[PDB]
């Protein structure tokens, strides 16, 4: 509703770099806001892409940014009569970004590893990593816990059973307000996927460069299944956290498991423990449903409410034919224990191959009304296909079903406008929670902030 | 706290077999590799094997094959040394041995078992 | 087999002395080794894994060093509990070896 849609503050990369594929609010140890920024395909020093990271200091010119340098140098240590290997040519550092007190934790999804035993070896595998780093203090830590030294001989033997060697790592990312750093993995397990959470401050006490390989021992990683439902299903794809049992000690897990089912799609709800509390199954074949989840109370009522994408949902329209559009859920916490029903509210897409739903960002209270509100990306969507952004107003029965105000992509075709999202966070401290949004494609980031209700 | 309490001192006779144990406290044995180190005041430290007790695959010293079987049973939390045809050179003192963090390491070591061997 | 050789096998010093126990490969190993503590009638504690870096809860007068295959460990001001024995492993090959070890001795 009340975005400034006139004078935005615009951040940009360099050119192929994919700036702003990935974007969080960053405060120091002063409560400064900046603007962390991924871009995944950022050239090393080998002239190869290997991804990098940026640190936005906030000015309403915006302009370009300052390196948030990390070690891109490929890793040998021979010990334990092997060899282990790491390789960052084309790992995407910076495909997800996520800050959590004065910590940013970078990921390279596409991080590749090896193990070589004489003539044997665990394959050259894309494990993945991420990357922690403490700004102020120049602190610098890692974090890859599908890292094996098994030989390949012996996953064959075990029909590929706990093969963590495919996991992609940091894929998807969140931090729980304890410190946890929640990792989704939609590799793991042969293509299962599998989440990997360990507290922030264990990765960095517990890690040495150089190792390579190293236990977590505060770690904890999902299971395995032998279920043909989760063959394939990219568990992982995306993550979130909130409050879904009723129990303030223990914080849930949200999980997007896109193909889940022969690509029915599926989100699930979990306690710490990986123990299934409920689960959203896809209503469509291949629409992705699963692709995005947010939490947020957008009802006022304490109760965190939960937010799915399903981007890739045909629409049905007239003479049998459908449209592709893309389709968002809302799902409304029940009063005490009770199981999260059918939809309260289905927002679906206008623009053919617009892909409604992309991502979804709580906005915090937008309009200062007492609900919180959410914004919810088409990155090719709008009269003209290259992107649109549109903002959803909580209310006391959910959300509204019109949006309130509709951000067109100041930036040309192709920028994947809205690809990334993220709100609730006061950058020019006016009282209002801003937004800012990536265009990969454009190698830029656009900042809007709120103003007073006119 | 990390912490390996192993068996009492055994006093067996040459010929016969031994087992010795090291149950894992305040963690679980599962987590890391377990090793085997023997010390005597002459010979000095010397490398038995280890055992991976998530799967059971081991590694021996060639000098140690025949004699040493390492196990374990993650039910129990325990990891077991096995001495089979006992001889004077057998009489040592052993210790099981887990890492810190490096995978490779040798950080935390047990109280230590004394074996005696004598008719 | 990797040859460990710890030199020396025993050294004469007094408290507040800064020594230093060194550990000689057949072969490099790169960091692959670590240092160990036997106070008198007692088990084992590790001091170094990787060379250079400090098992938690050692005290920071220890401190380990080198490169290919040559390294040493170091006392900065000893204290009374620190008249032990020391030994280096590598763990850079299968199987793992260790050194003949070294014993600090009170100076009189």
């Known amino acids: 509703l009340n975005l400034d849609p006139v004078q935005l503050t615009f951040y940009a990369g360099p050119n192929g770099s994919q700036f702003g594929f990935s974007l969080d609010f960053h405060k120091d140890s002063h409560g400064r806001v900046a603007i962390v920024v991924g871009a995944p395909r950022t050239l090393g020093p080998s002239q190869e892409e290997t991804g990098g990271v940026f640190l936005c200091p906030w000015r309403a010119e915006g302009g370009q940014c300052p390196s948030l340098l990390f070690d891109l140098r490929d890793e040998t240590r021979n010990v334990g009569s092997q060899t282990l290997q790491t390789f960052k040519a084309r790992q995407g550092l910076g495909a997800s970004v996520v800050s959590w007190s004065d910590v940013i934790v970078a990921c390279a999804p596409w991080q590749h590893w090896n193990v070589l035993e004489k003539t044997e070896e665990a394959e050259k595998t894309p494990v993945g990593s991420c990357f922690l780093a403490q700004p102020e203090s120049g602190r610098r830590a890692e974090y890859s816990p599908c890292r094996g030294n098994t030989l390949s001989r012996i996953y064959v033997e075990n029909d590929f059973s706990w093969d963590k060697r495919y996991c992609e790592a940091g894929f998807s990312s969140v931090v729980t307000q304890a410190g946890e750093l929640v990792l989704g993995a939609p590799g793991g397990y042969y293509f299962l996927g599998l989440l990997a959470q360990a507290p922030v401050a264990d990765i960095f006490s517990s890690y040495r460069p150089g190792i390579l390989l190293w236990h977590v021992s505060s770690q904890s990683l999902s299971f395995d299944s032998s279920n043909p439902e989760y063959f394939d299903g990219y568990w992982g794809y995306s993550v979130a956290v909130g409050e879904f049992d009723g129990d303030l000690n223990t914080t849930e897990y949200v999980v997007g498991a896109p193909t889940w089912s022969w690509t029915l799609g599926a989100v699930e709800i979990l306690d710490s423990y990986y123990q299934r509390l409920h689960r959203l199954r896809g209503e469509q074949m291949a629409s992705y449903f699963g692709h995005s989840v947010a939490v947020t109370d957008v009802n006022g009522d304490g109760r965190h409410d939960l937010l799915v994408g399903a981007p890739l949902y045909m629409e049905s329209r007239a003479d049998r034919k459908l449209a592709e559009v893309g389709r968002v859920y809302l799902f409304l916490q029940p009063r005490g224990p009770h199981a999260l029903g059918a939809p309260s509210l289905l927002l679906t897409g206008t623009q053919l191959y617009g892909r409604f739903g992309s991502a979804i960002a709580p906005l915090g209270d937008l309009d200062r009304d007492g609900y919180n509100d959410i914004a919810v990306a088409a990155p090719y969507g709008g009269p003209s296909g290259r992107g649109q952004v549109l903002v959803f107003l909580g209310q006391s029965e959910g959300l509204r079903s019109r949006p309130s105000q509709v951000l067109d992509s100041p930036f040309p075709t192709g920028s994947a406008f809205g690809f990334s999202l993220r709100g609730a966070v006061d950058i020019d401290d006016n009282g209002y929670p801003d937004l800012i949004v990536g265009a990969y494609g454009a190698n830029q980031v656009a900042v809007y902030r709120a103003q007073p209700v006119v | 706290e990390v912490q390996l309490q192993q068996s009492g001192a055994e006093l067996v006779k040459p010929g016969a077999s031994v087992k010795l144990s090291c149950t894992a406290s305040?963690?679980?044995?599962?987590?890391?590799?377990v090793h085997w180190v023997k010390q005597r005041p002459e010979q000095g430290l010397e490398w038995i094997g280890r055992?991976?007790?998530?799967?059971?695959?081991?590694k021996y010293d060639p000098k140690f094959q025949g004699k040493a079987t390492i196990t374990a049973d993650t039910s129990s939390n325990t990891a077991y040394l096995q001495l089979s045809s006992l001889t004077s050179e057998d009489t040592a003192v052993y210790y099981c041995?887990?890492?810190?963090?490096?995978?490779?390491?040798?950080?935390?070591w047990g109280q230590g078992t004394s074996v005696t061997v004598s008719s | 087999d990797i040859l460990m050789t710890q030199s020396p096998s025993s050294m004469s010093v007094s408290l507040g002395d800064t020594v230093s126990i060194t550990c000689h490969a057949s072969q490099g190993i790169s960091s692959n080794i670590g240092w160990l503590q036997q106070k008198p009638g007692k088990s084992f504690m590790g001091l170094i894994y990787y060379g250079t870096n400090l098992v938690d809860g050692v005290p920071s007068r220890f401190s380990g060093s080198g490169s290919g295959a040559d390294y040493s460990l170091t006392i900065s001001s000893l204290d009374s509990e620190d008249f032990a024995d020391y030994y280096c492993?590598?763990?850079?090959?299968?199987?793992?070896?260790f050194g003949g070890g070294t014993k600090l001795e009170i100076k009189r």
């Open positions: 041995v887990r890492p810190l963090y490096d995978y490779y390491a040798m950080d935390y």
């Open positions: 492993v590598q763990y850079a090959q299968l199987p793992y070896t």
């Open positions: 055992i991976d007790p998530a799967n059971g695959y081991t």
């Open positions: 305040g963690f679980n044995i599962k987590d890391t590799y």
